[PDB]
Amino acid sequence: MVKLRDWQEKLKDKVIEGLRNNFLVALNAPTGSGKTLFSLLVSLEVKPKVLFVVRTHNEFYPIYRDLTKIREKRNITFSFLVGKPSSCLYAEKGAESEDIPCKYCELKGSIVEVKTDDSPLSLVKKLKKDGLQDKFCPYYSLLNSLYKADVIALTYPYFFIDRYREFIDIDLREYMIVIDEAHNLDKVNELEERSLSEITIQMAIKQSKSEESRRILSKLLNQLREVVLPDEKYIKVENVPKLSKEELEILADDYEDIRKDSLKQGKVNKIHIGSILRFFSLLSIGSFIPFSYSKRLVIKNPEISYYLNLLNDNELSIILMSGTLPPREYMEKVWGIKRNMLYLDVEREIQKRVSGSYECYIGVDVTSKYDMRSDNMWKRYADYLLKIYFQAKANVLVVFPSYEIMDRVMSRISLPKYVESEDSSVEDLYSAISANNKVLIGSVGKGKLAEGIELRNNDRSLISDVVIVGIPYPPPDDYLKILAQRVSLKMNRENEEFLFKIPALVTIKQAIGRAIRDVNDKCNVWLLDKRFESLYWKKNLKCLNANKMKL
Ligand code: SF4
């Protein structure tokens, strides 16, 4: 401990004791408020070791830094694991973990002792260089270092996906478990969801080394065109193309050939047929449902509880934290958490905000509701964006309900803009808004755009205005209907909050949090949908003083 913030000082004992009484602790504290140091500090008082489960590798550094300025009368070593398409000496970007043919590698068993005497990401760069020279595998070296460390940091999949959790060699019962940005627990299923697309099959056919393989692929391609639609919503598919045990063996042979060869050229690229094979094997497990989505066949498990049941294990001490945790009742019915839980809200505890503030504007002459959407509505929305852009002190972050709506609106704008997409990366974003001055950033609520980085320059937010076009509600498609039934919740007024409002609120609050972090930050938030004027939204988005506006 070294000078704690007011909230940290007031909750430390409460949390430590709570964890000792076997309660799962849910901590609602804004990102950047010191929850990482807090969790580290309390965890060490509860158990001998600590496991941090985070969204990305970028969250590794603060843990590393906090630990080296923490006080403990004993040695505490830290270690971490980065993905294998990230630590493999012969992996090129785009390579899937399963695509790395470690079997045929002469480094599969060659490891060296690893010491985190430098920032995690820097250490990885060093291991890859020393690994090529000294002849050793960085991945296996890091993997092997885990069980000896006192504090370890891993990404979500290694905790929630069995296939990856098995790779790890730790008891778990001896670790205090800290799950960061826990609002993401709703999307754990995305961690193993498989997809099948026409583009992937063609690339598989182009990368093939077997015509007999290209044969089966060509056929699969035609059948796929009949079970997918462009609709940006999940439509259940009952007639998934079939692949016999024999056809699969033929495809598997082509996969093996490519893998072995790529490792020979020391260049492991994404092997397309691989995702195809993985799609069908997962489809056989039985827990997944196939759906059409944006011209692709996607398989996913609608039951959120499927991945979180591990959180109910009484032999595990757990802290879940985020700036926007859903309410307790939601964690019970939707996440399926049944064990005793202590739910703390940092700001409510210190009776003051620890996050920035904002002026709010509600547009009441627009809406994204189905009954009014038209080309004219999209034009009104584009006009709002221009108006907001012109008066913005800096960059403008726009959150759309879907890629379809973002396109209908953004396509009408000639101002400097950066539109999110599958290729969109962190540096591309940070760059764009660093080569055009004020930029209109187009993003879709379904995340998939940085979120694990701070858009600040010279210690000041790069985002002056956050715009919410319509309400980012999840569509009432087949995926949500099944998710609802798996939890015994009918599609009714009563359950609208749990099924539609809470995830929408999470999306909006996270976007806003992207423009503010410190108590000193200030921004404008434009809620562009007449529906936002209702007290429910003003109360929950904390803008009871919002300004009403038109045009
Ligand atoms: S260097 Fe070799 S053993 Fe290590 S992850 Fe790459 S292929 Fe696998």
Side-chain angles (χ1 to χ4, degrees):
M1 303 181 273
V2 179
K3 281 62 178 61
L4 299 307
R5 310 179 59 152
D6 276 3
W7 79 261
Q8 298 175 152
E9 169 55 49
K10 183 173 189 175
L11 262 37
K12 185 169 64 294
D13 307 315
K14 184 186 299 295
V15 175
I16 293 169
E17 272 24 287
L19 288 170
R20 287 173 172 165
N21 275 60
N22 194 58
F23 276 71
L24 174 155
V25 174
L27 183 65
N28 192 273
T31 306
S33 70
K35 55 185 175 181
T36 295
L37 175 64
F38 179 80
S39 67
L40 184 53
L41 195 63
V42 299
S43 295
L44 254 18
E45 296 281 352
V46 176
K47 281 184 177 180
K49 299 191 173 186
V50 184
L51 166 65
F52 281 84
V53 186
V54 302
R55 297 292 288 172
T56 65
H57 305 161
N58 292 101
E59 283 77 79
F60 290 176
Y61 177 73
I63 295 176
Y64 169 69
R65 176 195 65 204
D66 288 358
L67 183 56
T68 177
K69 84 95 54 181
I70 208 71
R71 294 180 175 180
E72 297 290 305
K73 289 65 182 184
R74 37 160 287 194
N75 187 207
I76 298 172
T77 58
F78 169 78
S79 199
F80 65 87
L81 178 62
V82 290
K84 186 197 306 203
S86 293
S87 41
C88 176
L89 257 41
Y90 318 116
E92 315 294 12
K93 278 181 168 297
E96 310 281 0
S97 175
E98 296 85 347
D99 290 354
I100 315 299
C102 298
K103 291 195 65 181
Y104 313 83
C105 187
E106 45 183 292
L107 279 46
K108 49 196 294 183
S110 302
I111 67 178
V112 297
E113 297 303 294
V114 313
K115 169 181 178 178
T116 300
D117 64 308
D118 188 29
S119 77
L121 292 177
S122 295
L123 169 49
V124 177
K125 295 281 72 64
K126 180 185 180 186
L127 284 178
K128 292 185 66 177
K129 264 87 288 179
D130 294 5
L132 217 190
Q133 272 296 297
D134 306 2
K135 189 178 182 298
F136 70 71
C137 177
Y139 175 71
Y140 284 112
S141 293
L142 284 169
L143 172 58
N144 169 271
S145 71
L146 269 37
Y147 83 110
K148 300 176 186 174
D150 301 299
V151 172
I152 59 179
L154 298 177
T155 55
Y156 268 47
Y158 296 85
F159 183 74
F160 300 99
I161 312 303
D162 307 300
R163 324 297 167 65
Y164 289 99
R165 196 195 303 85
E166 57 152 300
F167 230 147
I168 307 304
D169 305 56
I170 61 177
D171 186 355
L172 219 57
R173 298 178 308 187
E174 288 183 296
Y175 300 70
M176 230 316 292
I177 303 177
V178 182
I179 304 170
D180 193 35
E181 304 308 340
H183 56 282
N184 288 305
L185 296 187
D186 279 79
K187 312 286 78 179
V188 164
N189 57 184
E190 299 184 0
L191 293 169
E192 62 175 358
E193 76 185 16
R194 305 293 186 181
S195 76
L196 200 175
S197 61
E198 174 178 296
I199 181 180
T200 285
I201 296 178
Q202 301 176 306
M203 292 197 270
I205 287 177
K206 185 173 181 298
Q207 172 175 56
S208 186
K209 297 296 186 59
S210 176
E211 182 203 57
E212 185 164 53
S213 182
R214 279 167 294 187
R215 193 85 68 194
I216 307 175
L217 289 175
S218 293
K219 173 193 170 193
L220 204 202
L221 180 56
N222 291 108
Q223 297 179 168
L224 188 291
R225 295 205 189 84
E226 307 304 337
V227 301
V228 308
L229 285 178
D231 300 52
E232 191 176 345
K233 64 182 296 183
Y234 298 94
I235 297 171
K236 191 181 192 190
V237 172
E238 284 304 303
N239 199 49
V240 180
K242 311 298 178 184
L243 240 43
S244 74
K245 162 183 173 53
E246 296 64 57
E247 305 193 85
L248 293 174
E249 305 179 313
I250 297 176
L251 293 181
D253 295 332
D254 187 34
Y255 178 52
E256 203 64 5
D257 183 344
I258 304 172
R259 284 176 56 185
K260 224 186 308 301
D261 189 289
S262 66
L263 185 282
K264 288 281 296 306
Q265 311 302 295
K267 307 183 178 186
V268 187
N269 295 286
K270 190 180 188 297
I271 305 175
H272 310 294
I273 207 167
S275 63
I276 295 171
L277 287 171
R278 281 192 285 290
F279 174 96
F280 289 87
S281 55
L282 210 210
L283 179 64
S284 63
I285 298 303
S287 59
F288 287 57
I289 303 164
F291 305 94
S292 161
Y293 189 81
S294 296
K295 305 188 298 300
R296 296 172 308 191
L297 240 199
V298 185
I299 54 179
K300 52 160 56 180
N301 190 345
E303 239 188 310
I304 300 183
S305 299
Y306 181 95
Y307 303 89
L308 316 182
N309 185 51
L310 175 56
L311 299 179
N312 292 308
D313 192 340
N314 285 307
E315 299 195 306
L316 302 181
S317 297
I318 297 163
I319 292 175
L320 298 185
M321 47 185 209
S322 171
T324 60
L325 287 170
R328 174 162 205 144
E329 212 177 73
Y330 182 92
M331 287 174 76
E332 289 177 351
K333 280 55 186 174
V334 186
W335 287 2
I337 302 181
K338 312 174 180 183
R339 63 186 303 181
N340 296 320
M341 167 174 73
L342 213 211
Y343 195 108
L344 297 166
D345 188 304
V346 168
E347 283 178 344
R348 178 171 181 175
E349 288 288 350
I350 54 181
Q351 301 157 294
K352 63 173 62 174
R353 65 183 179 73
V354 289
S355 57
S357 67
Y358 54 86
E359 276 293 285
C360 190
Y361 302 84
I362 296 169
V364 301
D365 54 338
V366 290
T367 183
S368 60
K369 203 178 192 315
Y370 84 89
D371 64 5
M372 288 283 283
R373 60 180 63 185
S374 69
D375 287 46
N376 172 275
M377 185 63 76
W378 305 144
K379 191 276 186 175
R380 297 169 64 68
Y381 270 125
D383 284 357
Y384 256 109
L385 298 195
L386 274 54
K387 177 181 190 300
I388 293 166
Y389 178 90
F390 301 146
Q391 66 79 64
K393 296 180 182 180
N395 300 296
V396 180
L397 175 56
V398 191
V399 180
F400 296 93
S402 63
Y403 286 86
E404 86 214 323
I405 288 171
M406 171 165 77
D407 183 67
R408 302 202 206 302
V409 174
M410 237 64 238
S411 66
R412 297 168 181 269
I413 299 163
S414 292
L415 303 169
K417 57 191 182 184
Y418 182 73
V419 177
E420 174 186 358
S421 69
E422 297 169 60
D423 291 355
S424 295
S425 79
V426 181
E427 180 161 47
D428 289 303
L429 184 293
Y430 199 82
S431 170
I433 55 179
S434 294
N436 303 290
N437 295 301
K438 285 198 302 189
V439 174
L440 248 183
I441 306 165
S443 62
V444 179
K446 310 305 180 179
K448 188 188 175 307
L449 182 56
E451 280 291 299
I453 55 79
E454 299 192 64
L455 298 173
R456 308 175 68 80
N457 197 64
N458 294 300
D459 201 13
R460 288 203 301 166
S461 178
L462 282 164
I463 298 167
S464 64
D465 303 70
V466 177
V467 186
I468 299 149
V469 170
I471 301 189
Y473 280 142
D477 52 29
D478 288 341
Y479 169 79
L480 191 166
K481 289 184 174 181
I482 296 172
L483 178 163
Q485 64 183 60
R486 295 295 180 72
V487 173
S488 305
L489 272 59
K490 307 173 185 174
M491 303 286 279
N492 60 45
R493 188 89 306 179
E494 186 178 7
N495 301 314
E496 184 177 1
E497 186 171 3
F498 277 19
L499 302 180
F500 300 95
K501 288 183 170 71
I502 286 177
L505 280 170
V506 170
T507 295
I508 298 166
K509 294 190 181 183
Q510 282 294 313
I512 294 173
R514 216 67 170 59
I516 55 186
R517 291 293 193 64
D518 291 349
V519 288
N520 287 167
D521 293 332
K522 181 73 185 190
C523 81
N524 296 316
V525 167
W526 308 76
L527 305 173
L528 309 183
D529 197 300
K530 46 102 84 67
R531 288 173 293 173
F532 282 131
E533 206 177 11
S534 92
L535 202 62
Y536 177 88
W537 294 102
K538 293 186 176 181
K539 174 206 166 190
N540 288 291
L541 291 173
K542 285 190 164 63
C543 56
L544 295 163
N545 304 295
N547 296 296
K548 188 175 185 168
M549 65 143 57
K550 289 192 175 179
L551 295 176

